[PDB]
Amino acid sequence: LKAVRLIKFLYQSNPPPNPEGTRQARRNRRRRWRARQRQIHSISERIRSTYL
Amino acid sequence: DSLKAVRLIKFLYQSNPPPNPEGTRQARRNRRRRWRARQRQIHSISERIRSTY
Amino acid sequence: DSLKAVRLIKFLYQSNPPPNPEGTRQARRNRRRRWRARQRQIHSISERIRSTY
Amino acid sequence: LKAVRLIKFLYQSNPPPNPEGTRQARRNRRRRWRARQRQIHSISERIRSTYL
Amino acid sequence: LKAVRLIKFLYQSNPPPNPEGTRQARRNRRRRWRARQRQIHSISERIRSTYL
Amino acid sequence: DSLKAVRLIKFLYQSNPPPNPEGTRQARRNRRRRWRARQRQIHSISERIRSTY
RNA sequence: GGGAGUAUAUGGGCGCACUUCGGUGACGGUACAGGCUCCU
RNA sequence: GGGAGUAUAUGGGCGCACUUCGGUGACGGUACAGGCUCCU
RNA sequence: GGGAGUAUAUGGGCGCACUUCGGUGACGGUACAGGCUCCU
Incomplete structure (x- = not known):
């Protein structure tokens, strides 16, 4: 379908971090999530650049 | 249309080089894991393209 | 002072034109509803001005 | 009173959306709230432009 | 140690406000917290300016 | 190194002037309280510097 | 409703402590009160 | 405390699976550990 | 998943009220439905 x-769909495939646990654990989970988001952004950029 | 998608x-697959088979078993394992994750994402994309066709 | 408020x-009331009485009964109803909401807001303003006088 | x-008062008259329900419902409620906020901003602008 | x-450490020493209570109370607590943050920023700036 | 820290x-201490002993007992009290808070923060800093030495 | 700033600001009366009973306290207070300005 | 980035990065030892018992696994792992830099 | 905008926009069928039973209601509705565009 359209690149957008x-x-x-890619952003939808990134699960939100677990709110439960210690502050450090939750922090780590958030950081992992953010990393995933960054990746999604990068590959999304490389997709949008071509394919159209 | 479809040719551009293929x-x-x-292109995405070719842009994802194989992991580096060096270091401890764990290090190699997790490089292969990250790589496999990337591959999995690309296949998710491709499969979604196939689903809408 | 008060004259400027009036x-x-x-002005606000005059800037809110009547809804369009066209289309299905539901469409007309909800146009009239949006319009009535705007009118209600303007009256809330005016009533608050009257309350502080 | 003062326009501000x-x-x-106008912004105070905008009730926050209901957190309960499905993700789609809550999404809709949030969107309605945001629309209300936009309206408030517009009319606030048109008020502030005159009256002073 | 390093100024940063x-x-x-200074930002860590600022406790988050109490979520319990009335809207006005919570508002006040938040404002106090924000004031503390502003102070921390100011003194941090004056520290970083010198000492290095 | 340490000299710069001292x-x-x-410097921070010298940059924190004594409170104003004027007005009601409460006002003076809370000026002294704010001042004491600032002093306390500065000492927290100094003590942390001493702890890492 | 939310936010920013004024603010290295303002200080109100309860409770403790001390007292020569008039008051005093760099004590509860990193508490509490939240005005004014603007933004949304 | 919060955030950003380093990061298309780093990999630690538990549990499974396999085994020639030395090890191996694009298995639990989108898990888990969170250093360094800066911002607030 | 989140956000912005289109939007001073679009209006779908339940329940009330009225009715000449065809319909009507600036009634529940500040409800509810959420498409399209882009961002993340």
């Missing part, structure tokens, strides 16, 4: 839709 | 997927 | 309220 | 006070 | 570390 | 602490 695929990208939205 | 070329896109093949 | 002119303001009358 | 009236505007604050 | 000391500053981080 | 100079820093003394």
